[PDB]
Amino acid sequence: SKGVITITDAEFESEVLKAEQPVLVYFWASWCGPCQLMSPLINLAANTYSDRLKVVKLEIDPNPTTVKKYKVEGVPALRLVKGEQILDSTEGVISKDKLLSFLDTHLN
Template sequence: MAEGIVELTTASWDKEVLQANGLVMVDFWAVWCGPCRMIAPTVEELAKEYAGKVKVGKLNTDENPDIASKYKIMGIPTIMFFKDGQKVDQIVGAVPKPQLKAKIDALLG
């Protein structure tokens, strides 16, 4: 995983996401997913830019299907936002960085 990004698994999900304070951005992805690879550098840049403000994690949906199904992930990449353990928003698909930044800024606001 890139600097500033937490690799999420079924085992770490509750501790890293549901029990976390503040804003957590989770990138649901898979190795075979082209759009996931396209958005990965953007997610890494955002992790650095918002270090200390937003926790950024990535969850491989193939390796952790129970979490993907719990949150009804139908298409990837899906970026999901949690605030103090509660799901507050999500974006499906590879979207441009300004759109993700706007969403993060609004949720932090």
Template structure:
């Protein structure tokens, strides 16, 4: 992952996600997760495309158990969309790049127009 995606752990979760000024996409993954390897480039593409409107963070579930619990992550890959310190949308499981782009665009439009 490049500098567009911020790698965080439990200790950074409140500062980087819950206290963030802009919307945040949190990507939960695991080293042992095959689908996570397929989704990771799409998450990077989202960070590059929407970096001016969205913060993208990446958390390894095995090292971020508290954040995973807070976000009710039951499987990986998992995506959580935050705005104004609240999780407003979630997705679990593999997702194509186009589906992810559409999902993020929809959430951004919704939050920017509310």
């Protein structure tokens, strides 16, 4: 988990639901401007919590099943999960500081 892995609906169960660590799931789309600001930040979080968190990302268009499962009705969006448990969630661009606290609160 040094970085971010891009997954699809087909890989969701093995890469996320059955992962051993909590997973930060980032939803984005190519037509999403603000998503461009978040992508770099998500990559930073992955490197920063490399030993305690797995970070994955899904494009919404080709992945209808996961999008529906998490009620993703807007991008960018984040879901912090552990198996079937959703620990927290957020919508929209957030600052590096807000992201780090979002994570610290749950990882500790």
